[PDB]
Ligand binder design. Sequence first.
Ligand SMILES: Nc1nc2c(ncn2[C@@H]2O[C@H](COP(=O)(O)OP(=O)(O)OP(=O)(O)O)[C@@H](O)[C@H]2O)c(=O)[nH]1
Ligand SMILES: Nc1nc2c(ncn2[C@@H]2O[C@H](COP(=O)(O)OP(=O)(O)O)[C@@H](O)[C@H]2O)c(=O)[nH]1
Ligand SMILES: Nc1nc2c(ncn2[C@@H]2O[C@H](COP(=O)(O)OP(=O)(O)O)[C@@H](O)[C@H]2O)c(=O)[nH]1
Ligand SMILES: [Mg+2]
Lengths: 183, 132, 90, 237, 439, 429, 429
Amino acid sequence: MFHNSYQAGFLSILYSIGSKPLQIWDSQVRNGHVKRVTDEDIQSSVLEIMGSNVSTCYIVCPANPKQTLGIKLPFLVMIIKNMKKYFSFEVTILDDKNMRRRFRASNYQSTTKVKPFICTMPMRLDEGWNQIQFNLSDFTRRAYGTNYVETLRVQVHANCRIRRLYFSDRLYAEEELPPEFKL
Amino acid sequence: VRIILQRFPSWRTMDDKALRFFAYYTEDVVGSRIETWRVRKVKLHYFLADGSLSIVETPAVANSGLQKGTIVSRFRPDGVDVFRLCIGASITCRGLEYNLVDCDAFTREFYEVMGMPQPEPLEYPCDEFETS
Amino acid sequence: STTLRDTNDRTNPQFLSRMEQKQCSVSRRLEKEHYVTMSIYKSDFIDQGLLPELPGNPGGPADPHDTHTSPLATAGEMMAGQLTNRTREL
Amino acid sequence: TVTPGSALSGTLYVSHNTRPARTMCWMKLAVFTQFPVVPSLAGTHVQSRQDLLSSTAGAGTPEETSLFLQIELFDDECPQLCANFRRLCNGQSSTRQEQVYCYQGITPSYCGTYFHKIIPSYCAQGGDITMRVKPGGTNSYSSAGRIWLPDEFKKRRHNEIGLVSMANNGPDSNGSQFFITTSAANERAFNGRHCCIGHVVHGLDAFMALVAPFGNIEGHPSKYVVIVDCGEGKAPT
Amino acid sequence: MREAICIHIGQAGCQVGNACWELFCLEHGIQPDGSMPSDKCIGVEDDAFNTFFSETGAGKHVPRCLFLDLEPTVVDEVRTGTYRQLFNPEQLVSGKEDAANNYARGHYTIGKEIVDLALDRIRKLADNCTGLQGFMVFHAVGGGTGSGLGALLLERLSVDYGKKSKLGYTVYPSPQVSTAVVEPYNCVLSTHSLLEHTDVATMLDNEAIYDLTRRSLDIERPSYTNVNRLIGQVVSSLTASLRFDGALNVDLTEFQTNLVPYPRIHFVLTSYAPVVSAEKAYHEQLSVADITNSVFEPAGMLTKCDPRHGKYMSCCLMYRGDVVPKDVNAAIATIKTKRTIQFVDWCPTGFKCGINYQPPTVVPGGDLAKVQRAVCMIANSTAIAEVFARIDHKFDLMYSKRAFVHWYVGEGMEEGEFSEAREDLAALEKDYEEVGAES
Amino acid sequence: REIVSCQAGQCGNQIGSKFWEVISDEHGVDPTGTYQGDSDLQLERINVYFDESSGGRYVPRAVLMDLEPGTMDSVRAGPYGQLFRPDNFIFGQSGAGNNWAKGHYTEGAELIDSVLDVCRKEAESCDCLQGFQLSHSLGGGTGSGMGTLLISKLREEYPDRIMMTFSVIPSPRVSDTVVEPYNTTLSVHQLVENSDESMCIDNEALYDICFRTLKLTTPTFGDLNHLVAAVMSGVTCCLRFPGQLNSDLRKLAVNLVPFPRLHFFMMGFAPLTSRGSQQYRGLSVAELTQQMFDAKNMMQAADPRHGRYLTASALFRGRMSTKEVDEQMLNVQNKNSSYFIEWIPNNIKSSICDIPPKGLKMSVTFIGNNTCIQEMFRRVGEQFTGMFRRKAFLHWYTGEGMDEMEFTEAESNMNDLVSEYQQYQDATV
Amino acid sequence: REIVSCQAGQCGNQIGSKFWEVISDEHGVDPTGTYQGDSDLQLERINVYFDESSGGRYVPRAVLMDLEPGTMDSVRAGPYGQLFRPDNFIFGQSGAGNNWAKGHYTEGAELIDSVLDVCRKEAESCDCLQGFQLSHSLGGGTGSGMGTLLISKLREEYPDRIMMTFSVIPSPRVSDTVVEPYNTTLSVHQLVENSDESMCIDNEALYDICFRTLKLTTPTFGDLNHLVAAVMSGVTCCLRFPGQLNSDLRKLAVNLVPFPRLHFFMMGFAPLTSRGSQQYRGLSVAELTQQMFDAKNMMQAADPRHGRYLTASALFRGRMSTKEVDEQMLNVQNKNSSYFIEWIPNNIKSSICDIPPKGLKMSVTFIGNNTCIQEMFRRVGEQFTGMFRRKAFLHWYTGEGMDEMEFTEAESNMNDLVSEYQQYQDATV
Ligand SMILES: Nc1nc2c(ncn2[C@@H]2O[C@H](COP(=O)(O)OP(=O)(O)OP(=O)(O)O)[C@@H](O)[C@H]2O)c(=O)[nH]1
Ligand SMILES: Nc1nc2c(ncn2[C@@H]2O[C@H](COP(=O)(O)OP(=O)(O)O)[C@@H](O)[C@H]2O)c(=O)[nH]1
Ligand SMILES: Nc1nc2c(ncn2[C@@H]2O[C@H](COP(=O)(O)OP(=O)(O)O)[C@@H](O)[C@H]2O)c(=O)[nH]1
Ligand SMILES: [Mg+2]
């Protein structure tokens, strides 16, 4: 729904500062829990997402499945803490051929496997809090030789400590990064 | 069909119950090197349920030079019946004249049960290629 | 007398009633097989040529209508259409 | 029997196939209004050819000492099974080693067997070369011995009365016990599951009048009907 | 010449192959001894057997089959059965110890000690083959060996033979009944191999065949024999195009290219008709339109799923017998005009019909009756989404408490492979959703 | 695929005696060892239990265990006792004295080496060992103590083999031993840590079956042994004979053991008909499954109505249809979903063995991991706590060098097992 | 369309035994449980009253009921004693004391649980149960009390199934019990409130048929039960065999119950004749109908002439023309229409079965809802008052847990039924 909104510099889709920070997020939780907690490392409230099964517990944006996001910013940046649990995230985007495609990254994945509609890839997250970039255009061109247009859906599965999810159009050093964005 | 089933109590349907015959057709060969009159061997399948005749070419020696397989599909030839099918007889189908001279055990048993004694196999004419 | 220290024929065939005989051809075959005393593979997967040709038990003498006489189903007959022969005749 | 076809025809086929000539077996029947005290012992004695009255203790005076049944065997369709029937009629074993059952050797023959399951208007089954020493009885034994001979050519239809067939325990399981169909309406039950060994040509009326009608639905035999002497060829007298 | 190699994994696969091979022998007039009788001449075709039977110099035909089962009971009873002479002493592999209903056991402990010799047997069949069309796998994903060792054989075949056609006519856990309890685990885990390394996967779950025999054949006590006879009839209906001459001959690749729209989407519906008992066979006007309608109906199909709940994508019809192409397309037009079924928007044609002349052959002692015409449908449709949803819902119910996972973990598979399986099924489900989504 | 048997104690020895009697009867083997079967299929897989000799004699793969030689002589010279190999009769001079400590630490330890040697000699004589099946009673001294010692050594030696055990759980209703709670508590933790699958047997439940299901006026320990053997043979009927849907020991353990400590199963059998009603009752698979799931035919004295089935297994035997071996279980699931755990869909595993038991057209054996099994452990734990609070009968065990803390450890392990069953009984989606 | 029978009390047990004799003779069933009939029609619907076992034996769908075990050996001593299942023989240690109170509240109630279990099992053994049937005598304790308790429980469980009942009404002139009025009063209102249709038997109305029609020298309870079994089989002849005009118990109830509380019927059987008259008598449809509608051929004491027929029903058996099944009841309708009330015309249900009883080429049974059925109700009510007004024999009933207000309410419902059957007789259209 961000088609008619300015998309330059930064565009945050989830942050724990809000009173109700899941306005555009639907929490499909089964055998798990999604709630706001306090972190010991940063001494600030973050979003705890757990579930015995990683697939059944997740948060999806936008909340309405029919609706789709409209962010053109090709950089997806997350501030997520690794708890050595089974974690995954998924980004649904649109290509220049006007057919939606998917990029999923999981910590239990073995090798990067390309599929007609989904590219599954692994992650190896460092200990503690992690700050992760994702060049949507770069991955799209590397996996499919296909042009990036915009992002329809962002999905984060169970076993995660969400702090900030934001789209940016370019690499932002910690010096340029606004103070409300840093840890 | 009534009498054919009456005379064979064990039979129920004539499907996949063709008569296996053995015949040969001979043609003059003018531009060859060793033979001048060639004999090609065929196997006849006469399905009684459909009244249908099929011809399959079967060579004799390994180095025949001919192509093994079906040369004539299963169909109804014009004016061909069980009475016409006999050893020592002529079957004219698709322009080819087959000299029907040999049969099979099932076909012979069928003919004796019907009442007409099917003769014994006579011979296969010796072409110049066989004696080589 | 006491201290603390099946006369039957188990072989087929046994009586099958009028309805049971017509049923047992395909339906209730397991029920109507009295004593088969063998596995399933040996009971079912047997020499098919030895069994009667038509499925199940035929009612009586072979029905002529069981056989198909129409030449149209033949492979060569559908290779060569009827009006090709009509062209031959004309 | 079989003549190979012309090899130079290009295919392997049989030119001439002559069905074997139909063979002949005969049996002699003794009927008793009562059963012997020990049917197995009586059968063993009759097989050993002792006097019938002494052998059958408690069976009483035989109602008919001699009932001759003549069977023509359909050898064109039953090589092995009707060979088994002939061997059992002659009391000839098809194996060199001797079969022993329940710690006593047994000879394969119908000379002591008795009809044990006679269902009226269905069939009369007997011919257990075991002599039914055990309560249940067994069909496993045959001329070869501890072998179930495979079934062959179940195509023959059971319209006619007096057809003799190996009563099986299932497909591909044929032993010694044979049943004579006693009515013309059981083709439904008898077709496709039993092999028509042969048909009776002599003694049909006697078998229909004195042995067949007695019995019940389960097959318990009311009359003790025993094969006293059996063999091949035409029946004596 | 246009030959295919049949490979039967597991008990279900072995029994299905037994039924298929007795049906093939009946079709080609091959005695259980392995050779056609000299007295009899069936005359089906000069070289129809060549696809499934290899010829020897003694006039004997040997099936191009591989019975690979990890436990000796089924293989030994096949050896002791009537078809002892038909089946080769080799190509009939038996394992010493069963996979014990464990995908990990059949894929990581017992799988490797037998996959080498299984591939050796496959190579000894393939080098004999000259125009090998492909491989026809027969197994059940719900079983331990049939899932694990089946998966192992599938990806070894894919890495060895390259891009040859692979058709797995596989039996899935049924929506309501199910033999085992770790059966959802086995199915969800085997979905990996049946996705990446299987060109076409054919749904053959149990209750559809069960109820089909229940009312269409009116049998109070049918069993695995009848189920396997129906499955073999379906297999023969599909393979008759490459076996015998037909009006519209379609090979394995010929119809799999029309059946598979996307690489991950190859699970397909199954429906065969007319299935009818002897009593009811000689009383109905068995027309091509009638049998096509019966096939299209949600009732008469071999896999338990509702096409109305989903969206049809591409149906391949296999007509056999005296079927006429005008009857075929008249039935096609009638069923297209019928609004009960509906095709996906991006596939207007959606139909692949192929006609063969030889009718289904009688299996004496079976339950099918003599029919002059028949038709089998293999339909790719979005209806598989609901059955896969049921399967991974059962998987999630089992995996929430980590029940039965110790059995798999102790047999050499990592804990994350279950997460892999759940992720892959979710991705496939939303792939079906995407392909069913309107443009 | 062959399984080797061990019998421990007097109870286990007679259990094995009747088990071998019924096995030999079903395989057509006379006590002299010769074969007189009525089917060719009897010799197809006779090697599972019997090893052939030079003279063709069939020797059961049975290892016999007790310190008292009286029951050793009894099993040796029983009606079928001449089958067992003489060198498999390992017996001591002084009996265990009904003492877990004596059987497990002092007297059985000096004798366990020979029994390990014997079971080894029986093990590598087998082509592909499936595993061991041991039969004992937890109430007795030598049946519990040295039996648990042997299963522990068997776990140490052969880790992957299936260690089936048949433990006869003592009960207050049929109690004839004051140290039954002590022996049972000391043996349950060993059974938990040293058994792939355990099957609990209750003399009182067998007794109730004998009175009501079988209508026997004077039931006997031999009748109990026959009832136990009817399922001891039925658990491996699938291993021994072909069927539409065959199984084996691991093939059913993987379906009956969701978690490593939940390998205690409650035992059922069908059909069981009285002598007078044998000819009146119609043996149909619906009746088979109804009587199987019926609580009275259950030879486990744990009422199924007080628990929730973790898993169930039905080993059917005979000529029957998959229709009624699957739809019947589905129907039971549907109308008793309150008694079946939700997060385990289709709690019932089914197996089909075509060859039926002799004299029966069809039969079925039931193996149930129902959560109600914890109540017998609860009552034996209550008895143990009552006796151990005032330290009664402790000196007999402590004089054998066995520590006092081990009783408390056994209490803790039994309580952990009981709570482990509780948590999955009341666990929700 | 199955009917499951239950016989309670000594009278009920003997009547049911003779009924099973008659049914087995009709269906060609030996005492050992085998079929040997000469017609396929017997096997076509032999499943209505019988169930085939595994061995082919036909077990009756019968339940045996009595507090005194001395009759459950007599019933098995009957000619078809072993035909019934052994488990259905359910009895008590002590008899009902000839007491409705302890047959219905103390002893019968503690025994009715197994009764309900057996009835449920046998009912669900049927494919589609047409209903239950019961046979008993109201004058006693076991048949009246516990029989009516079973009736109440079976209406609790299966309301839609037809509940057939044969109650034997005591009469003062053939009385052999002093508490007959008490038991009959306490059971008649139970029947009213729980029985689908309850036709009555009087031993007097059997004895006079024996002495006058059959001219028997020494009529016995066996002959009485034979006469009862006559109609007990005639009412379901149409169910068991095909006919030109079919009917069932439910059709008979629908036609013969104009109001829910009026379901007490009156019966008769034809042909019945002695030795001498049999050779002189000419069998015809007219003779059959005249005999069945004659007063002396009735198995209830009250004369048909005194009352008025609310509805009648004639179930004929044999090969006969429909001309004389229609025209003969047309005659009897017109010639003495004073039997038949006016507001309901064409009062006679007719049904034809093609198969007559074995040995008879033509027969008929009669079921009638006349308003004379209340005459013996009035007699038993007067005998009840004569004892209740002085609290005679009331300590026996009050010491078994029930109270006098049940006697008062039984009297109230008794008089209600009497008035319903009385004033609809003279009600003006
Ligand atoms: N269609 C069909 N399905 C069958 C047949 N036999 C078994 N199945 C099903 O296939 C599934 C897999 O077979 P399993 O019983 O696991 O046997 P398996 O594949 O060898 O695996 P293991 O039990 O470990 O040996 C079973 O759950 C059955 O439901 C059959 O004959 N036909
Ligand atoms: N079912 C059954 N139980 C038995 C048998 N023999 C003994 N028991 C039980 O075992 C218990 C005693 O076990 P015991 O013989 O002392 O075992 P041991 O000391 O280890 O030899 C008693 O409570 C009996 O109920 C038997 O043959 N069958
Ligand atoms: N018709 C008939 N009447 C009987 C029979 N047995 C008993 N009665 C009558 O029933 C009355 C006694 O009932 P009773 O048998 O004691 O009832 P119960 O206590 O329930 O068994 C007597 O007046 C008899 O006239 C019988 O076999 N046939
Ligand atoms: Mg298996």
